[PDB]
Amino acid sequence: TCPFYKKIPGTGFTVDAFQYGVVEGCTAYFLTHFHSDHYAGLSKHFTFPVYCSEITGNLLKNKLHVQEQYIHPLPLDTECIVNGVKVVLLDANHCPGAVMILFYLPNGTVILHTGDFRADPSMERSLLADQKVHMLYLDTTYCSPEYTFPSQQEVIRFAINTAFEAVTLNPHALVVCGTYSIGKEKVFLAIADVLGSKVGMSQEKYKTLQCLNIPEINSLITTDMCSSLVHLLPMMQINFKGLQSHLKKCGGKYNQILAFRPTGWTHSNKFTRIADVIPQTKGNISIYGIPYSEHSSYLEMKRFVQWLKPQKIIPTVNVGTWKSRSTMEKYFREWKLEAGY
Ligand code: NI
C-alpha cells in the first residue's frame, strides 16, 4: 500500500509510486527521474498514464519497454494542464531527465515536490520566484550538518588534474570509472576530454547513454573498448580483484590502472579536503573515492528552504525511524525561527 508522502491531496495524482499495484483513485502516475528506488514496479505491462520529462520517457520506452501510448513527456518550464490541474516541471539538478513538480491545486494550494535534487541558488530565479508554496515534499537525504562535500566543479577539477598527470607520466596507464545508474556522467566525460579519448563501455551502458539528449554524444562515447583509454565498468568491479581481471583482458596494451569511484558522502569528508585526497593502492592499481554528489548538502538545503518559506514540509527521505524524523523536524524549526517565517 502506497504511503502518504507519495500522494498529492486534492488530485488523482501520485509521485514515484509504481511498486504498490493499482493505487485506488490514481488517474496519473508522475515519475521524477529514472533511478530504480523511484521507478520500482514499472515494466512493459504497465497500462496507466505516466507523466515525466522527455529524457525519462526515452529511458522508459527503450530500457523498460513501457509502451509508447502510456508515456506522456512534458517540456520543462512550461505551464501544462493534466487531468484538469495546472502543473510545471522544473530541472532538479540531479541526474539527466530529473525534475521537480509544481502542482496548482483547484482549491488555491500550491505544492512543490522536489523529487531528488541538488539545491542551487539558480532555482531562486526559476518560475518558483513568482508565487507562494504552501507545502514542500523535500529530498532530505543529507539533512544533518555533518554532511559537507565540495562543489561538483571542484571535484571535476581534481579528477581531470589527477588523470592528466598520471597518463602524461605513463602513456601506458588506463583510466577506469565506475557506474551503476544514470547520473554523474561529467566524471568520465571530463576525464576523457582532457585525455583526447572517447569513453569505452558495454553495449547496455551505451544504449542508456544514447537516451540522454547529451549534445554531440556520438563524438564522445563508443563500444570499441580497444580504441579508448577511458573505460566504464560496473561499480561492483571497482576493487583490486576486478581491476586486475580487467587489465588481463586488455591484451598487454596497458601496465597500470588508475580508477575512480564516485560515491556520495563518506565520513572521510569530516576530516579531509578534496585537495588532500589520496588513493588506495596495490601494485600497479590505484583507486580514488571522489565525493561527487547529486543531492543537496545540508547548507544548500537550508538555503533553499529559508528562501522558499514553505508553510509545511513533508520529508521524502530518512522517514523510516523515529530518531530520523525527530532530527529533521528540529532543523526545520530552527530554520523557520532563524529566518522569521
Ligand atoms: Ni535519485
DSSP 211: T
Cα of 167 from ligand 1 centre, angstroms? 33
CA angle 296, 302, 308 (to 5 degrees): 105
CA angle 115, 236, 259 (to 5 degrees): 95
Three-class DSSP category at 143: coil
Question: How far does the chain reach from its first CA to its final CA, in angstroms?
Answer: 35
Cα of 164 from ligand 1 centre, angstroms? 30
Cα–Cα distance measured from residue 93 to residue 50, given in angstroms and rounded to the nearest whole number: 21
- Cβ neighbors of 296 (< 8 A, separation 6 or more) are 117, 118, 119, 139, 141, 142, 304
Cα of 296 from ligand 1 centre, angstroms? 12
Cα of 116 from ligand 1 centre, angstroms? 5
Cα–Cα distance measured from residue 63 to residue 36, given in angstroms and rounded to the nearest whole number: 12
Amino acid letter at 2? C
Cα of 234 from ligand 1 centre, angstroms? 18
Cα of 111 from ligand 1 centre, angstroms? 20
Structure solved via:
X-ray
Cα of 179 from ligand 1 centre, angstroms? 14
Cα of 189 from ligand 1 centre, angstroms? 20
Cα of 35 from ligand 1 centre, angstroms? 5
Cα–Cα distance measured from residue 86 to residue 82, given in angstroms and rounded to the nearest whole number: 6
The backbone region for 104, taken as left when phi is positive above 0, alpha when psi lies in -120 to 50, beta otherwise, is beta
State the residue for C-alpha cell 524549526.
Answer: 333
Cα of 226 from ligand 1 centre, angstroms? 32
Cα of 77 from ligand 1 centre, angstroms? 21
Cα–Cα distance measured from residue 218 to residue 57, given in angstroms and rounded to the nearest whole number: 20
Counting Cβ atoms within 10 Å, is residue 269 exposed (0-12), middle (13-18) or buried (19+)? buried
| Domains of the chain: residue spans and CATH | 1-147+296-341 (3.60.15.10), 148-295 (3.40.50.12650)
Cα–Cα distance measured from residue 55 to residue 59, given in angstroms and rounded to the nearest whole number: 7
The data reach a resolution, in angstroms, of 1.5
Counting Cβ atoms within 10 Å, is residue 251 exposed (0-12), middle (13-18) or buried (19+)? exposed
DSSP 97: T
